[PDB]
Structures are given as structure tokens and as C-alpha cells.
Design a protein around this ligand. Structure first.
Ligand code: CPS
Ligand code: CPS
Ligand code: CPS
Ligand code: CPS
Ligand code: CPS
Ligand code: SAH
Ligand code: 5ZZ
Ligand code: CL
Ligand code: SE
Length: 346
């Protein structure tokens, strides 16, 4: 019964069977109660502030060939671009002028910048008195150390899938063991570390999703980014099914219940599969939003998946838009950098 599962969730009995049953039950009443629980846990632990992370997708060059990704190296039907360091720093300054208190630098795994151009950019942005988050993929420990010395605060590296067999198949350049090692290194070096996963990957099962939740709980990540898999037409997975919004929303809600003091975004992928999907997610456990701050003409070239929102409006629309969103949700903008505020418990 759904009631018994909520009760166990409420009492923090986070066993594999409780999580599987939560993900397996499709009853509307159960789902709504689950979302309300997550919403309330969010409010009690991390409050009503929604933290804004302005993302600059500074290069769509990638050396890897992940099967799901539109930036995979085998995709010749994409115009590749690189922003200059000056462009990236000045675009970050514009976001800070617009009120962003974290700048996210995201790219394909593009060797050109690595490690020293990144270090130089990070130092320049840190002079602006904001947090800097990097999401550059897998690199040597030395690179991650140089970027931490340069001033980077956080690093996003979704674990993608905690099933090693499926991980290797979908990411043939690498492995779950390497992904995990990178995440452990980043934690050791003192980054706030973000993990997370896609929901609805071809071949991924409900038990796989459970394992993603247990993985997250085990490592106590500061941030958890979750969204659906969205097939991209220029990839091997073009004809596979998109991930289900509701199932993905349940993964966000359970992540909040399991990691009550974590930072959890309402991802752009949630708002791509369903109109208004970010706003729903912010009411089901999420507390972070990541407006796209990539300038034209590059913005439209950063297509990890199609339909990726926020492309036809002026490239300065997204920060204002998310501030309006936060108000109409009855929430507040973050006042500080929105680092994790751990609540130590039993
Ligand atoms: C309560 C009002 C008016 C009903 C009436 O009076 N006529 C009806 C009209 C349209 C309905 C929503 C939509 O269906 C979309 C969605 C379907 C989900 O399943 C359940 C949630 C949701 C948001 C619905 C909630 C509610 O049911 C609505 C607002
Ligand atoms: C807005 C709609 C429809 C509400 C509605 O239209 N219900 C009929 C009228 C109710 N009113 C009280 C306005 C008047 C009643 C007098 S009347 O004369 O109209 O019958 C309601 C119906 C189900 C609600 C979601 C679920 O909970 C799950 C979840 C819980 C979180 O915590 C917050 C997020 C989320 C997604 C909820 C959001 C929102 O809240 C929903 C969509
Ligand atoms: C960038 C330009 C020119 C002046 C400038 O370069 N301004 C730097 C401000 C730096 N900060 C954001 C750190 C100030 C924080 C002050 S505060 O008192 O908010 O703490 C200034 C002039 C008017 C400013 C907008 C309006 O105001 C309305 C609105 C307020 C929200 O709030 C943030 C978003 C928004 C759209 C603003 C963005 C930006 O800012 C604008 C465009
Ligand atoms: C109306 C659109 C479909 C649009 C389309 O036509 N495409 C469908 C797709 C996903 C649906 C929501 C999720 O299920 C989660 C949640 C379940 C609750 O029970 C009722 C509220 C809520 C927010 C649902 C409302 C509505 O039903 C949504 C937005
Ligand atoms: C300029 C654009 C249009 C509008 C649309 C929504 C507006 C924000 C919200 O109202 C919430 C909040 C209220 C404070 O009072 C002032 C700050 C803030 C962040 C507003 C600034 C600005 O006014 C916004 C971005
Ligand atoms: N087709 C697709 N559908 C939904 N999410 C996708 C996707 N392709 C990629 N992503 C997501 O995009 C995220 C950032 S990719 C850019 C950063 C870095 N190259 C990296 O791989 O970490 C990935 O972690 C993955 O979860
Ligand atoms: C490119 C991503 C999948 S990674 C990020 C920023 C996150 O979850 O941290 N959300 C993005 C999106 O949903 O488009
Ligand atoms: Cl961040
Ligand atoms: Se690493």
C-alpha cells in the first residue's frame, strides 16, 4: 500500500524494497503524496530561496562519443564552436551584472582549454565575488587540482547511470569506475560535488533507478542533477523512447527525501519534455534553477538533446525569466552563493 511506503519514507526507512515500491506504484494519490512530502522536506531543510546558476556553454567540441549525446564526436551534422577566454569572462561579468551569484562553465570535453585556459578564466571570474562551478567532464586529477587552486568552488559530473554494464555501453570511451573515481577525487580536493543521472535510458530498469538513488545516498553529494533522457536524431539512440516525466519527477522527489539538505536543480531537460516542467519540479523537491547564459550565435549550437529550451529569446532573457518564475511560484531568489548548508542529523 502506498500509505505504508509513505510512512516508511517519512520515518526514513530507506531500504531498497521501499525505494523500488515507491518507483513501482503508479497511483495518482500515492504520487501526489510523494511530491507533497518532497516539497515539504525541501521547504523545511533548504527553505524558499531558489538559487540561480547562470550557465555558459562555452564550447561544443568533444573528444568522447557517448551514445546519447548530440555533441558526440561522431556527429558531423553540427557546427562546432569555441568561445574565446575574453568572451567567456565578459559574458560571466554580464551575468554577475544581472544578479547571478554562481557562474557555471560547461563544455564538451574540449582539449583546447585544458587545463591552463580554464584556470585563467576561473581566476578572472572569481575576482567578481561569485561562486564558480565547472562542468567539463573527466580529466586528470592534476587538472582538477589546478582548477581548485585557481578558485573553482564546485564541479558537476553526473554519474549518468550506476549500472556499470549499461554505463560502459553508453559511454564507450570510459567506465563507471572512472566516473566514480573522478567524483571521489573532486570531493577529496574540496569541491562541492554534483552527481546525478538520466532517467529512461535505453535498457535502464526500475532496479537501476533504485541503484542510482542508493548511490546518491551513499556518497552524500552536494548537488544532484536529474533529468530525462531525450533522444537526439544525430545519435545511435535516435529511435529510442524518451524518458518519462513523471518517473523522472519521482526520482527528484526521492532524491530530496534521501538527501534533504542537498541542492537539486529543476533541469532544463524537465522543461523540454513538458511545458512548465521546471516549475513543477521546483514544487516537488528542487531548489535550484540554471538559466542558459550562452550568447548567440553559439547558444543554438549546444544541442545535447533537441528542443532544448530557451533559444529564440534574446540571450539576456533567461535570468529575468527565472526571477519572474521564482516570484510567481511564491519563492525567493538566493541571497548568497547558495552553497550547501548541511543539517547534521541522526
Ligand atoms: C479542477 C479543474 C476543473 C474541473 C471542472 O470543474 N471541470 C480541472 C480542469 C483541468 C484540470 C487539470 C488538467 O486536467 C491537467 C492535470 C491532469 C492531471 O491528471 C491532474 C492534475 C491536472 C493539473 C488537472 C487538475 C484539475 O482537475 C483541473 C485544473
Ligand atoms: C493546481 C492543481 C489543481 C488544483 C485545483 O484546481 N483543485 C480544485 C480547486 C481547489 N481550490 C482549493 C482552488 C478551490 C476548491 C473549491 S472548488 O469550488 O473549486 O471546488 C493542483 C492539483 C494537484 C496539485 C499537485 C499535487 O498536489 C502534487 C504536487 C504537490 C506539491 O506540494 C506541489 C506541486 C504539486 C505538483 C501540486 C501542484 C498543484 O497544487 C496541483 C497541480
Ligand atoms: C546591468 C544593468 C546596468 C547596471 C549594472 O551594471 N548593474 C550591476 C548590478 C550588480 N548587482 C546585480 C550585483 C546589483 C545587486 C543590487 S541589489 O540591491 O539587487 O542587491 C542593469 C540595469 C537595470 C538592471 C535590471 C533591473 O534592475 C531589473 C531586474 C532586477 C533584478 O534584481 C535583476 C534583474 C534585472 C532585470 C536587472 C538586471 C541588471 O542588473 C540591469 C539590466
Ligand atoms: C498536461 C501534461 C501533458 C501535456 C501534453 O499534452 N503533452 C502532463 C504531463 C506531466 C503531467 C504532470 C505529472 O504527471 C506530475 C504531476 C502528477 C499529478 O498527479 C498531477 C500534476 C502533475 C504536475 C501532472 C500534471 C499534468 O497531467 C502533466 C503536466
Ligand atoms: C524586470 C522583470 C520583468 C521582472 C519580472 C520579475 C521581477 C522580479 C520579481 O518581482 C521578484 C523580485 C521582487 C523584488 O521586489 C525585486 C527583485 C525581483 C527579483 C524582481 C526583479 C524584476 O522586477 C523582475 C525580474
Ligand atoms: N540526449 C540527452 N538527453 C538528456 N540529457 C543529456 C543528453 N545528452 C547529454 N545529457 C546530459 O548532459 C550532461 C552534461 S554534458 C556536458 C558536460 C560534460 N561533457 C559531461 O559529460 O559531464 C550529461 O551529464 C548528461 O546527463
Ligand atoms: C545539460 C544538463 C543536463 S546538466 C544540468 C545543468 C544539471 O542538471 O546540472 N542540467 C542540464 C539540462 O537539463 O539541460
Ligand atoms: Cl552550482
Ligand atoms: Se579523475
Amino acid at each position: 500500500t502506498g500509505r505504508e511506503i509513505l510512512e516508511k519514507l517519512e520515518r526514513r526507512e530507506f531500504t531498497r524494497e521501499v525505494l523500488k515500491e515507491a518507483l513501482s506504484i503508479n497511483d495518482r494519490g500515492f504520487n501526489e503524496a510523494l511530491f507533497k512530502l518532497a516539497d515539504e522536506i525541501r521547504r523545511k531543510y533548504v527553505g524558499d530561496e531558489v538559487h540561480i546558476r547562470a550557465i555558459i556553454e562555452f564550447s561544443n567540441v568533444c573528444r568522447k562519443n557517448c551514445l546519447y549525446c548530440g555533441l558526440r564526436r561522431d556527429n558531423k551534422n553540427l557546427k562546432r564552436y569555441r568561445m574565446t577566454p575574453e568572451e567567456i569572462v565578459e559574458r560571466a561579468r554580464l551575468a554577475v551584472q544581472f544578479g547571478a551569484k554562481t557562474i557555471v562553465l560547461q563544455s564538451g570535453e574540449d582539449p583546447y582549454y585544458m587545463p591552463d585556459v580554464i584556470s585563467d578564466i576561473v581566476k578572472e571570474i572569481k575576482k567578481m565575488g561569485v561562486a564558480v562551478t565547472l562542468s567539463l567532464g573527466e580529466w586528470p586529477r592534476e587538472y582538477y587540482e589546478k582548477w581548485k587552486e585557481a578558485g573553482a568552488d564546485r564541479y558537476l559530473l553526473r554519474h549518468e547511470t550506476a549500472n556499470p554494464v549499461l554505463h560502459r555501453k553508453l559511454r564507450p570511451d570510459t567506465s563507471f569506475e572512472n566516473r566514480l573515481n573522478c567524483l571521489l577525487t573532486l570531493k577529496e580536493l574540496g569541491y562541492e560535488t554534483g552527481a546525478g543521472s538520466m532517467v529512461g535510458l535505453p535498457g535502464q530498469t526500475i532496479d537501476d533507478l533504485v541503484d542510482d538513488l542508493l548511490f546518491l545516498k551513499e556518497h552524500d553529494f552536494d548537488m544532484v542533477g536529474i533529468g530525462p533522457f531525450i533522444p537526439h536524431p544525430d545519435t545511435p539512440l535516435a529511435n529510442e523512447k524518451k524518458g518519462d516525466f513523471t518517473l523522472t519527477l519521482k526520482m527528484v522527489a526521492l532524491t530530496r527525501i534521501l538527501l534533504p539538505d542537498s541542492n537539486i536543480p529543476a533541469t532544463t531537460a524537465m522543461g523540454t519534455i513538458v511545458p512548465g516542467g521546471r516549475e513543477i519540479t521546483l514544487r516537488c523537491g528542487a531548489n535550484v534553477i540554471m538559466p542558459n547564459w550562452t550568447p548567440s550565435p553559439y547558444r543554438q549550437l549546444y544541442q545535447l538533446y533537441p528542443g532544448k529550451i530557451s533559444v529564440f529569446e534574446k540571450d539576456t532573457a533567461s535570468i529575468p525569466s527565472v526571477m519572474k518564475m521564482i516570484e510567481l511560484l511564491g519563492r525567493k531568489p538566493g541571497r548568497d552563493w547558495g552553497g550547501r548548508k548541511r543539517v547534521f542529523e541522526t
